[PDB]
Amino acid sequence: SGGHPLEFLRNQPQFQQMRQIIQQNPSLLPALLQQIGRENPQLLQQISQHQEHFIQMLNEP
Amino acid sequence: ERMQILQNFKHNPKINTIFISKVGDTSFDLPEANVLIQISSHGGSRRQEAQRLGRVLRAKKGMVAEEYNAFFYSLVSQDTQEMAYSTKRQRFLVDQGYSFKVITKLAGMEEEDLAFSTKEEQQQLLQKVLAAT
Amino acid sequence: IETPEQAKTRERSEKIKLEFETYLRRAMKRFNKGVHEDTHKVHLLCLLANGFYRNNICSQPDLHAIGLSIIPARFTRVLPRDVDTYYLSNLVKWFIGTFTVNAELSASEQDNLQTTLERRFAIYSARDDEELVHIFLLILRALQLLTRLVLSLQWLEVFCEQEEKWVCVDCVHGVVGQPLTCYKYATKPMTYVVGIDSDGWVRDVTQRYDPVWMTVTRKCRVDAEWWAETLRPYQSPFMDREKKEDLEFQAKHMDQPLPTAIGLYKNHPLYALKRHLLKYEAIYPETAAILGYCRGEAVYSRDCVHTLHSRDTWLKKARVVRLGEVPYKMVKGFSNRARKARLAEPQLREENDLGLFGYWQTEEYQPPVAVDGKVPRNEFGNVYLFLPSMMPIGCVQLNLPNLHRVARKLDIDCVQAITGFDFHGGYSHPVTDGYIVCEEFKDVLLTAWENEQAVIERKEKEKKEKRALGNWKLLAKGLLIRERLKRRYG
């Protein structure tokens, strides 16, 4: 059990949709880019570390 | 802040009344003045307050011809021991020929309104003083 | 002309407000630019995850079996060790003649990539050029060829053991061993080029295919540290392969473009122009006479360019200049007193020329050893303690507040522990962290500090109790006097 700050983010519903988008179709990339740039200081900070957990989150089927 | 107050006295004409404790003897520099009012003294330091008078009052242009161009007042409470101090002290200044004319009453105090006109204020002042033993 | 002091105060208020708002503006610009850069990095991470997903889909065994069945026996019997340029060209030509470009085929987002590729195999058709690249990758993986799918943010890299080289292959355009041609047929904006192995191992191959990597893209790509951290987990276990690829890249890029533009020689260690150095960095003519020229500008090796620091800064770096060392660079000296003096008269601003020294010119600082219970002190009457090694032997640092009061009370030699420098208003005040004392009295000083802490605690207790008692006494005497005077007049 690799307790990471992205554990809430991994199961975060909007972030769940974002990881689903990243997993298969990058077409909706601009929507995620706009969301993160407009308001995601927390995502900006937390995405720096624990990249493997972030990638595995993006790989959730 | 000490030098701030000193410069305010030196430069600001609105404020020309500075109250100084015993530190005015030698602890700092006294700007040249013309009216020196001494209320309380050490209690017989005939040289200390005479030196304070000498340092406070300096040569000023404009009234050099007149024999009275600097004004010094020494407030002494009647029938107190303070009188015994003053005569003890100004003795040194008597050695230099300086004279002190006794002014029992001040002309003009009646018309101008001053503090403690009522004794009821004065008894409150007495309360305050006796509070500090 | 009216109240000049008010005007001066107004000017000072405007100045301070302007400084505040300008530094706030700069901070805000830094914040939003960093947000943009981080969003760009997250977009790059999304692209990397997309490449991972594509490679994982291309790693399916069903696609391998389909490719093996479709591939004729002529291409099947050729092992990866025997694969050469002619075989690659023949296979690419067969692929072109096998699968064509037909975007008219029905496409649905519901259909999976694997299912779509299997259907295209069934009909021997395709939908897009990237689909052709994926189909060629599947065909190569059918023969278990050591191949990596390379994407531009596309082609394949085949690790030929005859040359031990990652040869570039592009099926749609019939490109074999033409990396520069890959620059044309890939994505036009080429800032990142990533090669993912069938197992998911990621390699940077932007340098090979982008001719402008070593000049512009070197200074115009993403941060090296963040990207290195990103690629660290997926570093390929083939360490020997990585070393060989690095050596090949070095051989290819060793002064290959031969630029001769003055701007290019700036901030480029491979060239290290004398005029393109810094105030502290300086060339070494002993090991660098001439290596090239650009518009009358000589070239010297970067290894002959060395950084320098002041003797005080070297001591801060725990380094002591050797006796008789010559100043490697005599440069502008600036310290509080020195800065004010130089502002007083500019003739000595150039004439100061503090003489820095090289690292090779300075030895490691050797802290002394306390003798006879005496703590050594510098000219400033202290010890510089930028690093723990700087402490003299036989000394102990104690970070106990107000401990020196007890030390002098107990007549114990105690000094401050100079840590660094702080400057609130423009002056580098030394910064100390605790007191350096002799090791012999360390625990005695601790005991004294404990005793004095307890004593000051109880002293504060009795002081506040006596304050309350004095307040009681003052109130009682005040009421007594009030009653007495009221009785005197009522």
Interface test with C, best of B121, B123, B130, B133 (most C CBs within 10 A): B130
Is-contact A6 A54, C-beta < 8 A? yes
DSSP per-residue codes, B37-94:
EE----SS-TTHHHHHHHHHB---SS-SSSS--SEEEE---TTSHHHHHHHHHTHHHH
Q: What are phi and psi of C130, to 5 degrees?
A: -65, -35
Per the CB < 8 Å rule, is C477 touching B131?
yes
Our CA-based measurement puts residue A55 at a distance from the nearest CA of chain C, in whole angstroms, of 7
The H or E element that residue C232 is part of is none
* Shortest CA distance from B132: residue in chain C: C474
Sign of dihedral through CA atoms C444, C445, C449, C455?
A: positive
Is-contact A52 C46, C-beta < 8 A? no
SS3 C481: helix
As given in the structure block, the two tokens for residue C478 are: 């005040």
Q: Name the burial class of residue C88, with classes exposed (0-12), middle (13-18) and buried (19+) by CB atoms within 10 angstroms of its CB.
A: buried
Per the CB < 8 Å rule, is C45 touching A54?
yes
Q: How many whole angstroms separate alpha carbon B5 and alpha carbon C106?
A: 92
Closest Cα partner for C317 from C369, C377, C378, C387? C387
Closest Cα partner for C130 from A33, A26, A21, A29? A26
* E-strand stretches of C272-327: 293-294, 297-298, 319-321
Q: How many whole angstroms separate alpha carbon C269 and alpha carbon C271?
A: 5
Rounded to a whole number of angstroms, the distance between the first and last alpha carbons of chain A is 19
Is C482 near chain B, with CB under 8 Å? yes
The H or E element that residue C489 is part of is none
Is-contact C399 C446, C-beta < 8 A? no
In chain C, which residues have their Cβ closer than 8 Å to the Cβ of A58? 46, 49
Q: How many whole angstroms separate alpha carbon C208 and alpha carbon C157?
A: 12
Is-contact A52 A60, C-beta < 8 A? no
Our CA-based measurement puts residue A36 at a distance from the nearest CA of chain C, in whole angstroms, of 7
List residues of chain A with CB under 8 Å from any CB of chain C: 22-26, 29, 32-33, 36-37, 41, 43-44, 47-48, 51-52, 54-55, 58-59
Per the CB < 8 Å rule, is A22 touching C43?
no
Query: Could you tell me which residues come within 8 angstroms of residue C448 by beta carbon, excluding any fewer than 6 positions away?
Result: C406, C410
As given in the structure block, the two tokens for residue B83 are: 């009188």
Q: What are phi and psi of B43, to 5 degrees?
A: 115, 35
Q: What are phi and psi of B41, to 5 degrees?
A: -125, 180
SS3 C144: coil
3-state secondary structure C37-55: HHHHHHHHHHHHHHHHHHH
Buried b vs exposed e over A21-54: b needs ≥16 C-beta within 10 Å? Answer: bbbeebeebeebeeebbeebeebbebbeebbebb
Resolution (Å) of this entry = 4.0
* Angle (nearest 5°) at CA C412 between C410 and C414: 130
As given in the structure block, the two tokens for residue C275 are: 């005029």
Closest Cα partner for B36 from B63, B58, B60, B3? B58
Our CA-based measurement puts residue C36 at a distance from the nearest CA of chain A, in whole angstroms, of 7
Q: Name the burial class of residue C372, with classes exposed (0-12), middle (13-18) and buried (19+) by CB atoms within 10 angstroms of its CB.
A: exposed
Is-contact B41 B89, C-beta < 8 A? yes
Q: After which residues is chain C broken (C to N over 2.5 A)?
A: 153
As given in the structure block, the two tokens for residue C103 are: 């975007």
B55 is in an annotated binding site: yes
DSSP per-residue codes, C415-448:
EEEEEEEE-SSS--EEEEEEEEEEGGGHHHHHHH
- Classify residue C317 as left (phi > 0), alpha (psi -120 to 50) or beta: alpha
Residue carrying the six token digits 């706009």: A34
* Shortest CA distance from A44: residue in chain C: C38
Partner residues linked to C371 by β-bridges: C374
The H or E element that residue C149 is part of is strand C147-152
Query: Could you tell me which residues come within 8 angstroms of residue C328 by beta carbon, excluding any fewer than 6 positions away?
Result: C282, C306, C308, C355, C356, C357, C358, C361
Closest Cα partner for C329 from C294, C289, C361, C373? C361
Our CA-based measurement puts residue C305 at a distance from the nearest CA of chain A, in whole angstroms, of 35
The H or E element that residue C167 is part of is strand C165-170
Q: How many whole angstroms separate alpha carbon C349 and alpha carbon C343?
A: 8
The domain segmentation of chain A, as residue ranges, is 1-61
For chains B and C, what is the number of CB pairs under 8 angstroms?
13
Give CB contacts under 8 A, 24+ apart, made by C377-383. Answer: C377/C415, C380/C418, C380/C430, C381/C415, C382/C415, C382/C416, C382/C417, C382/C418, C382/C430, C382/C432, C383/C415, C383/C417, C383/C418, C383/C436
- Classify residue C151 as left (phi > 0), alpha (psi -120 to 50) or beta: beta
Q: How far is CA A25 from CA A58, B7, C113, in A?
A: 12, 77, 10
Q: Do chain B and A touch: 3 or more Cβ pairs under 8 angstroms? A: no
Please state at what angle helix C129-142 crosses helix C113-123, rounded to 10 degrees.
80
As given in the structure block, the two tokens for residue C362 are: 């300075």
Give residue C468's identity as a one-letter amino acid code. Answer: A
* Shortest CA distance from C479: residue in chain B: B131
B58 is in an annotated binding site: yes
Give residue C477's identity as a one-letter amino acid code. Answer: K
* Shortest CA distance from B133: residue in chain C: C477
As given in the structure block, the two tokens for residue C439 are: 């090791």
Is B123 near chain C, with CB under 8 Å? yes
Sign of dihedral through CA atoms C443, C446, C452, C455?
A: negative
As given in the structure block, the two tokens for residue C422 are: 């702080």
As given in the structure block, the two tokens for residue B93 are: 């200044």
Q: Could you say which of C39, C52, C226 has the minimum Cβ distance to residue A36?
A: C39
Our CA-based measurement puts residue C18 at a distance from the nearest CA of chain A, in whole angstroms, of 28
Give CB contacts under 8 A, 24+ apart, made by C257-260. Answer: C257/C211, C257/C214, C257/C215, C259/C215, C259/C294, C260/C294, C260/C295
SS3 C234: coil
- The experimental method behind these coordinates is cryo-EM
